[PDB]
């Protein structure tokens, strides 16, 4: 509904918004969209949601074993994973979905999966049925090599850019974070953004 | 010579199957079970080996038991091997009925159960049951009826049978004294005399054996499978004065 | 021959916890041309003695390794054909390695694909075991790499391996270098320095002619992928060996 | 001398008989001693603990396992052919009976459901059979209390008081020297521990025994207070200490 | 059209103080159309008894299946079937078939030999158990019986004066009714005898 | 006369044939194939931390020593040591590690050691009833820090025979290293061992298996493993240097 | 009255 | 078919409505919606009931073998995630949405569940056609660190909204809540609030009233 | 199937000493523009080339192969670098026969797939297949509205089979990139990008 991701210098950054939707009744208002598919490997699930769980957790069954018998993964090798359950069955379901990794040779990398089927490479992206309204508030708002301090907000001025324009599908915001020497579960709340 | 022993398809060259005909020695190993055909209600009887004192030898009945309401078994021969096709028959006499209507007749499931026993005497590396029966029915086309099948297939209708050990005698004790009318409570004081008679024991007591009976004897025509208890067996047993 | 009831298959253990039909095949490996394979400080370079049984065959063009996707090579010493079936399924999984996580299949899984599969031989009883023992080595993300594969399903890494008939012989030569080198040697001495084990072991064999043949992979001189030699590189090199040893 | 009759099972020798479950059935009786014995309101299921080294945990591993609320057994031979014979036990009351009758099963179709789990394997070469026994123990509420046996060859002898294993007959020659017609669970329980004190050698406490009964329902182990009719279990293996005591009480 | 809407029948079940009572219609025919004056829609196996409603294929089809089970239940067991399990084998008898299934209202009746309780109960074409004590029912008409049943039975009933209230239920009903009524048979049951009346009703 | 009857009259090369002593023999048969290596691990409980000890030989000069091991990090919170050929252990390993995984796919949770030994254990002994498959002529040890149980052991043999030890050895050598702990467990009546730190574990263990084994040993013949609650890992060498020092 | 949305470590499992 | 499910400190709870609907019409006075998959678990599903009731006495039986099996006490969220694997197979033919919550031994926990095998957590939640409704009320009362018989009140009090303010729903009030280190307290009728009064006489019908075509005897004998 | 991204259109030419072949760089979701830094050129080889359109999740399911083709290539053939190396023919047929047995199976690729480059003698090659896998040749060739607004355009250039070696490089790279400005002058989906290819029977090749 919206989400988002964003890399930076010290690590990557992934959020959402914790509201979901059926018809048009607040259901789940405190909804995560965030994956522990393995320790620095993280997703955001857009689209479906009896679908995407289910993805995810087998995504784990072939990290938890490939984590086992050959090594640490990449992230390379998440995507054509996920690519591969999202093709090969793309005329059953609705998914498109994120995420998110680092090494400590390689830095933070970010890559998006729509509907379909297809894995491309990007800093910056997005998702979402009701996150088509940042396009242009964040194109111009954005660079590389950035930090903490400075994406941060950026993601924060984003989604209530969305939400507060006609966004139709969102509630609080949480994010995380990836650098190489830990992650931390933010959180940020109505009264922060909705008076900003 | 070369021994042809040890599969039930070779053919010795006289023609004979051998290993077949072993199964017809593992059967007198077994319990002895007598049925005699009345003119108004069969009989059927029985014996066991093993009769220890500390085991439930009242409820548990081993060898007799029952197909539906019309038909009844007593077995001799392996234990394994009898709940495999004594299922298979109750699970033959309903889809029979549930069919067709109408009970099931005897002719029918002992050509049937005895063709199962021969489709493991011809094919695959499988074995030949070791099992013999003794039946007894009631159906329109011929009214009561007895029956009897070997471990190979092969069946043949009879009068008055025992099965499994000492039947030699407990043929000739029974050939030389059954009348032809014998009225059932006239059967069952010849079956225990045969069993009295050849046994290996002595005692012949009530926990030893069962014995059952059919009876058609109700007005109002109909079937009655029963089966003896052990408290009216005493009562067949004092009356004769063992 | 201490069992003569526990040979006749396969899948059965002697008194001694062992099975004796890996115990013959071993022996046929002993029957068959050397191959060896040195590691290095980039890369690996392998090597073989090709055997010619007349003047008729041609030459460079019956080769004998196999190479599997662009990063690693596999060698035999034994029987081939059980061999060639075995890289015909190593050349197959890693694909099946690639679809599935887009990586060219590293050397450790390559292996556990490998010494996993030839392990189920020796188990059942309607098949017969490999009487191969083949090196196999190469270049990934974490360096390189070399191992041996044996009949019995084990691998071990070897910085050097020998087999065939010039075992005994290798299994020196290849232990000198590593105590003057442990620094690691470079991919432009080590492959005459292979030439001139090749030539030392066919002693064995000193009836009949034959032909040498090299095939290497290392990061600098060829960027990372598995390549065979030509010209004045393997020439030299055989000039370098023969020289040496006269 | 061989008989060659004998390593195979569909071969019938000239007195009719089959050759490797005959073996099987010594396979137990080399093995150690277990039993259950029975009473008017109650059933008894004891066998002990051969540990093979001081260092086994000798807690980890039941010889009893429960098979309904209302069922358990116990062994007598090998084991490996117990915990994989149990686990397609209980199973079976839970897929063959259970979802198309709602409740758990009585005892001797449970029984049934066993011996041919016993028989698949007796009738094809290619598979050794179960070198083991068993000795189910249970209740139902239009036959009563019971107790049965299963031997390897898919046969049930039912029994009332009965043991098996090497320290057999000098068990059963013992029973009857003390069984009754109207006997008592807690009388038919000290008997069948006095039972096992000659059939052993050594250490004779809560860590070298182990048992079970069978009684009134035990709905404190059900967990699930406030329902009038689901009285809970009826099967529980006693402790170290509950045993502990009796023993100095005799 | 609906399986359930074709040939027509109504059945009613009531507990009362150690007795219960069933019912059932005889109609049967195709749509707007009757053929037969006489099909016993009610059934018995043991003294546990079953009455079944909708199409008829599946009346004459369940009919067998279950008397295909019971005969092996007694075989096996050595014991009749009691109906609290009999009623958990007609759902999961029915369950497996979620999907191409049978269109029934059934039934159940009988007493538990044990406690000489009283017991009944209905269920759907995919096995819901519904365990009402006063009565329930099932057919084309349920719509017009839930009505002219509930204000009728009080609790605590007795075997004739629970006959009468039954029979005026079902006639009242089925007069109504659009698609059945020729002539009805009811069972009073007791702990140890049964008995079969029929009614009089209308006829063409 | 043991197998004087057993050699000559088959009954030692079919799994499914018993002898009338009850004795198969085949899998009988399999344990001398655990002691072809001959090599002799350990392992131990802790307050909160567990241990294996494992020698890991000098052969000739040419191996390249890190890939050499018999310790196989399985998951997460477990780990296992073999005793026997390689092969026979990798197939083991293998089956399992993608069975901890399927669990905790379809139950919720990663497996405890328990069931692990119960699993692949409930696997040996099937094929010993079918002829699938010869039964893996090893011996197994797996290792966890439980939430539930805190420090467990577990053991598995060709059979299928699976208990929690308390302490233990296996291989050629059980008699000597055993006796070496047996007896020092009386001492104390304790089935863990105090000194909280894994480090402090790992001393004692070690100079168990130098005293009772029968010579001194390097960093390099030695490779260990340890479990704490969120892991399992291998270690350096330091941990002896600051031993004999002491000493 | 949004305040307790952070004790949601995910979906139904993970933690 | 309104129902609730509703964390506290030290526990949880759950309750539901007790009106069947085979459509409008009513065809149960009452019926327990609550059912068991193991002692202290518990779950309620709102929907097609005869799916909702193969899952539960289905899954409490896949799962028991699974507590001996592993020597173990259960977990709840096992019980979620082989059913949440077992509607996705069928992707919606299930006429099932449910909610399940219940003790183990890392805790306490409740879980909701839908049919395509959309699951998610909240220490609050309410389905069926009350859903709305019984939603707001305890939205409005609903507070951190709730203690015990504060639930009772305010999970009961809740569909008593999914009564009167809703149609479908109807009488009774079935709860079963549980505490840790405690069994499973089942409150069976908590409180019955309408009750059929009586209708101002009884028409009812005296003997000899019918006619009866004929009349025979049923006999259900035996061997003899 | 029924698709989401999809491409647009690419374009083609023969010459005398060669061919080029070009298309641009864009992945859309509709009206929307999402990616632009994608390719449509998958080289294989140094010979060969091959332009895709249609549905970007199969053109990266045909670049996934065609790079294992070549792999099973060189296996077991030393010499093939040099002359059994893979000249267009030994491809396209591999890019057509999947394609009807992928349409009767009734679950297809809608991409719609160019091919160009050059034998080993050193005669052109180029040749087209859509979705259902058909099949054609001539001196140029587009995609999608390439097709019904470029390659009229392109013929007079090149009319027929005659005035191919009446022509040269310079002006043929001068022609397609006047195509390039009307797609991006009136093309809906278009891009201002480009990616470019030409090969060479001497020379060889080269890229954007």
């Not at chain 1, 089927?117 to 800093?123: A, C, E, I, N």
């Not at chain 2, 209507?101 to 499931?109: F, G």
């Not at chain 5, 067991?77 to 029915?94: D, W």
């Not at chain 9, 591999?94 to 480059?117: C, D, E, F, H």
């Amino acid at each position: 509904t919206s989400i988002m991701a964003v890399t930076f210098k010290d690590g990557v950054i992934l959020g959402a918004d914790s509201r979901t939707t059926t018809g048009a009744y607040i259901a789940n208002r405190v909804t995560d969209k965030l994956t522990r598919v393995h320790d620095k490997i993280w997703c955001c699930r857009s689209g479906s949601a009896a679908d995407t769980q289910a993805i995810a957790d087998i995504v784990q069954y072939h990290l938890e074993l490939y984590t086992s018998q050959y090594g640490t993964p990449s992230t390379e090798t998440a995507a054509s994973v996920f690519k591969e359950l999202c093709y090969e069955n793309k005329d059953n379901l609705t998914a498109g979905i994120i995420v998110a990794g680092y090494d400590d040779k390689n830095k933070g990398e970010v890559y998006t999966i729509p509907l379909g089927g297809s894995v491309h490479k990007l800093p910056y992206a997005i998702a979402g049925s009701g996150s088509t309204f940042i396009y242009g508030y964040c194109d111009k708002n954005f660079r590389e090599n950035m930090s903490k301090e400075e994406t941060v907000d950026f993601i924060k001025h984003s989604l209530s850019q969305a939400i507060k324009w006609d966004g139709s599908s969102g509630g609080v915001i949480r994010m995380v974070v990836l650098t190489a020497a830990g992650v931390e579960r933010l959180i940020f709340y109505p009264d922060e953004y909705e008076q900003l | 010579s070369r021994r042809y022993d040890s599969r039930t398809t070779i053919f010795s060259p006289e023609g004979r199957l051998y290993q077949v005909e072993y199964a017809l020695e593992s059967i007198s190993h077994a319990g002895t079970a007598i049925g005699i055909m009345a003119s108004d209600g069969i009989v059927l009887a029985a014996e066991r080996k093993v009769t220890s004192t500390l085991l439930e030898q009242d409820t548990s009945t081993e060898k007799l038991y029952k197909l539906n309401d019309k038909i009844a078994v007593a077995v001799a021969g392996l234990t394994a091997d009898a709940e495999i096709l004594i299922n298979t028959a109750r699970i033959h006499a309903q889809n029979y009925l549930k069919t067709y209507n109408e009970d099931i007749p005897v002719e029918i499931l002992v050509r049937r159960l005895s063709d199962i026993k021969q489709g493991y005497t011809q094919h695959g590396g499988l074995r030949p049951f070791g099992v013999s029966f003794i039946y007894a029915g009631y159906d329109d086309r011929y009214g009561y009826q007895l029956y009897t099948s070997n471990p190979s297939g092969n069946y043949t209708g009879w009068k008055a049978i025992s099965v499994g050990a000492n039947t030699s005698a407990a043929q000739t004790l029974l050939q030389m004294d059954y009348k032809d009318d014998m009225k059932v409570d006239d059967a069952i004081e010849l079956a225990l005399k045969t069993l009295s008679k050849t046994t290996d024991s002595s005692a012949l007591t009530y926990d030893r054996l069962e014995f059952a009976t059919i009876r058609k004897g109700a007005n109002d025509g109909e079937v009655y499978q029963k089966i003896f208890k052990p408290q009216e067996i005493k009562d067949i047993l004092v009356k004769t004065g063992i | 021959s201490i069992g003569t009831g526990y040979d006749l298959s396969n899948s059965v253990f002697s008194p001694d916890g062992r099975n004796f039909q890996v115990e013959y095949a071993v022996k046929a490996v002993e029957n068959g041309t050397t191959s060896i394979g040195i590691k290095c400080n980039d890369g690996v370079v392998f090597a073989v003695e090709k055997l010619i049984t007349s003047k008729l065959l041609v030459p460079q063009k019956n080769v004998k390794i196999q190479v599997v996707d662009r990063h690693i090579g596999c060698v035999y010493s034994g029987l081939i054909p059980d061999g060639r079936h075995l890289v015909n399924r190593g050349r197959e999984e890693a694909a099946s390695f690639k679809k599935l996580y887009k990586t060219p299949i590293p050397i450790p899984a390559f292996a556990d694909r490998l010494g996993q599969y030839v392990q189920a031989h020796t188990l059942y009883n309607s098949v017969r075991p490999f009487g191969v023992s083949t090196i196999f080595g190469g270049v990934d993300k974490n360096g390189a790499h070399l191992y041996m594969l044996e009949p019995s399903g084990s691998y071990w890494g070897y910085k050097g391996a020998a087999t065939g008939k010039g075992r005994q012989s290798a299994k020196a030569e290849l232990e000198k270098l590593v105590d003057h080198h442990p620094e690691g040697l470079s991919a432009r001495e080590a492959v005459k320095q292979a030439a001139k084990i090749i030539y030392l072991a066919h002693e064995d064999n000193k009836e009949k002619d034959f032909e040498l043949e090299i095939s290497w992979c290392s990061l600098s001189e060829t960027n990372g992928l598995h390549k065979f030699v030509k010209g004045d590189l393997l020439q030299e090199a055989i000039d370098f060996a023969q020289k040496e040893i006269n | 001398m061989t008989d060659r009759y004998s390593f195979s099972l569909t071969t019938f020798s000239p007195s009719g008989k089959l050759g490797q479950i005959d073996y099987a059935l010594t396979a137990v009786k080399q093995g150690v001693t277990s039993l259950g014995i029975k009473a008017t309101n109650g059933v008894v299921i004891a066998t002990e603990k051969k540990s093979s080294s001081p260092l086994a945990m000798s807690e980890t591993l039941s010889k009893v396992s429960l098979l309904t609320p209302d069922i358990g057994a116990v062994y007598s031979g090998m084991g490996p052919d117990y915990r994989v014979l149990v686990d397609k036990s209980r199973k079976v009351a839970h897929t063959s009976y259970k979802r198309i009758y709602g409740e758990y099963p009585p005892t001797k179709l449970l029984v049934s459901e066993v011996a041919k789990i016993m028989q698949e394997a007796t009738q094809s070469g290619g598979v050794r059979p179960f070198g083991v026994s068993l000795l189910i123990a249970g209740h139902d509420e239009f036959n009563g209390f019971s107790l049965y046996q299963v031997d390897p060859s898919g046969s049930y002898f039912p029994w009332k008081a009965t043991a098996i294993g090497k320290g057999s007959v000098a068990a059963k020659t013992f029973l009857e020297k003390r069984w009754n017609d109207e006997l008592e669970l807690e009388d038919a329980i000290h008997i069948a521990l006095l039972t096992l004190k000659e059939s052993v050698e050594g250490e004779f406490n809560g860590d070298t025994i182990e048992l079970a009964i069978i009684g009134d329902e035990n709905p404190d182990l059900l967990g699930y207070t406030g329902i009038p009719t689901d009285k809970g279990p009826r099967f529980r293996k006693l402790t170290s200490q509950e045993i502990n005591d009796r023993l100095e009480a005799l | 059209s609906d399986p359930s809407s074709i040939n027509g029948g109504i059945v009613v079940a009531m507990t009362g103080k150690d007795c219960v009572a069933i019912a059932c219609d005889l109609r049967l025919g195709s749509q707007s159309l009757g053929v037969s004056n006489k099909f016993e829609k009610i059934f018995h196996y043991g003294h546990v008894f079953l009455g079944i409603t909708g199409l008829a294929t599946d009346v004459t089809t369940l009919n067998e299946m279950f008397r295909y089970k019971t005969n092996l239940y007694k075989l096996k067991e050595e014991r009749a079937i009691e109906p609290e399990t009999f009623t958990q084998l007609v759902s999961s008898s029915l369950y497996e078939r979620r999907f191409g299934p049978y269109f029934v209202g059934p039934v159940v009746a009988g007493i538990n030999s044990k406690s000489g309780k009283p017991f009944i109960a209905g269920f759907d074409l995919i096995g819901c158990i519904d365990e009402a004590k006063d009565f329930i029912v099932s057919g084309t008409a349920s719509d017009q019986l839930f009505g002219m049943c509930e204000s009728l039975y009080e609790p605590n009933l007795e075997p004739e004066d629970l006959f009468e209230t039954i029979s005026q239920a079902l006639l009242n009903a089925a007069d109504r009714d659009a698609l059945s009524g020729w002539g009805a048979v009811v069972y009073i049951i007791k702990k140890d005898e049964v008995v079969k009346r029929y009614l009089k009703m209308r006829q063409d | 006369s043991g197998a004087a009857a057993a050699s000559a009259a088959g009954y030692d090369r079919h799994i499914t044939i018993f002898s009338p002593e009850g004795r198969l023999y085949q899998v009988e048969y399999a344990f001398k194939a655990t002691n072809q290596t001959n090599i002799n691990s350990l392992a131990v409980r802790g307050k909160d931390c567990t241990v294996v000890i494992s020698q890991k030989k000098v052969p000739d000069k040419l191996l390249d020593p890190t890939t050499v091991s018999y310790i196989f990090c399985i998951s997460r919170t477990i780990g296992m040591v073999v005793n026997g050929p390689i092969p026979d252990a990798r197939n083991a390993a293998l089956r399992a590690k993608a069975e901890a995984a399927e669990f905790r796919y379809k139950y919720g949770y990663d497996m405890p050691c328990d069931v692990l030994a119960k699993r692949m254990a409930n696997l040996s002994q099937i094929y010993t009833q079918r002829a699938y498959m010869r039964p893996l002529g090893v011996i197994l040890t797996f290792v966890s820090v439980d939430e539930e149980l805190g420090p467990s052991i577990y053991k598995t043999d060709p059979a299928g025979y699976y208990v929690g030890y308390k302490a233990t050895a296996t291989g050629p050598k059980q008699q000597e290293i055993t006796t070496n702990l047996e007896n020092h467990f009386k001492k104390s009546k304790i089935d863990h061992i105090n000194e909280e730190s894994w480090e402090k574990v790992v001393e004692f263990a070690i100079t168990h298996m130098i005293d009772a084994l029968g010579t001194e040993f390097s960093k390099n013949d030695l490779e260990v493993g340890v479990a704490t609650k969120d892991k399992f890992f291998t270690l350096s060498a330091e941990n002896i240097e600051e031993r004999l020092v002491a000493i | 009255k949004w305040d307790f949305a952070k004790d949601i470590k995910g979906y139904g499992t993970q933690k | 078919t309104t129902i609730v499910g509703v964390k506290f400190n030290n526990g949880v709870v759950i309750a539901a409505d007790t009106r069947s609907t085979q459509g409008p019409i009513v065809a149960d006075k009452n019926c327990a919606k609550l059912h068991r998959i193991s002692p202290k678990i518990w779950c309620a599903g709102a929907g097609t009931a005869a799916d909702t009731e193969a899952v539960t006495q289905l899954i409490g039986s896949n799962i028991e073998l699974h507590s001996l099996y592993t020597s173990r006490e259960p977990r709840v969220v096992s019980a979620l995630q082989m059913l949440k694997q077992h509607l996705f197979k069928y992707q919606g033919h299930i006429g099932a949405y449910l909610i399940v919550a219940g003790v183990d031994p890392t805790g306490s926990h409740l879980f909701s569940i839908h049919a395509h095998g959309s699951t998610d957590v909240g220490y609050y939640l309410s389905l069926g056609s009350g859903s709305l409704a019984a939603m707001a009320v305890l939205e409005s009362h609903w507070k951190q660190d709730l203690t015990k018989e504060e639930a009772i009140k305010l999970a009961s009090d809740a569909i008593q909204a999914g009564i009167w303010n809703d149609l479908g729903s109807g009488s009774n009030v079935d709860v079963c809540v549980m505490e840790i280190g405690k069994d499973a307290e089942y409150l069976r009728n908590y409180l019955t609030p309408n009750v059929r009064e009586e209708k101002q006489k009884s028409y009812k019908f005296p003997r000899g009233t019918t006619a009866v075509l004929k009349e025979s005897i049923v006999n259900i004998c035996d061997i003899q | 199937q029924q698709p989401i991204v999809t491409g647009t259109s690419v374009i083609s030419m023969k010459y005398d000493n060669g061919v080029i072949i070009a298309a641009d760089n864009l992945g859309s979701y509709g009206s929307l523009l999402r990616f632009n830094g994608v390719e449509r050129l998958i080289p294989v080889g140094d010979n060969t080339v091959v332009g895709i359109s249609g549905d970007i999740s199969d053109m990266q399911h045909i670049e996934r192969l065609l790079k294992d083709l070549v792999t099973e290539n060189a296996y077991d053939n030393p010499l093939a670098d040099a002359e059994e190396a893979l000249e267009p023919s030994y491809i396209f047929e591999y890019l057509a026969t999947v394609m009807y047995q992928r349409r009767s199976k009734m679950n297809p690729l809608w991409n719609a797939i160019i091919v160009a480059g050059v034998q080993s003698n050193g005669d052109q090659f180029l040749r087209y297949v859509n979705l259902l896998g058909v099949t054609y040749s001539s001196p140029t060739l587009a995609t999608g509205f390439g097709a019904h607004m470029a390659n009229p355009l392109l013929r007079k250039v090149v009319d027929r089979e005659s005035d191919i070696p009446k022509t040269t490089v310079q002006v043929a790279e001068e022609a397609i990139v006047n195509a390039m400005r009307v797609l991006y002058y009136r093309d809906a989906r278009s891009s201002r990008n480009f990616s470019l290819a030409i090969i060479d029977k001497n020379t060889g090749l080269t890229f954007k």
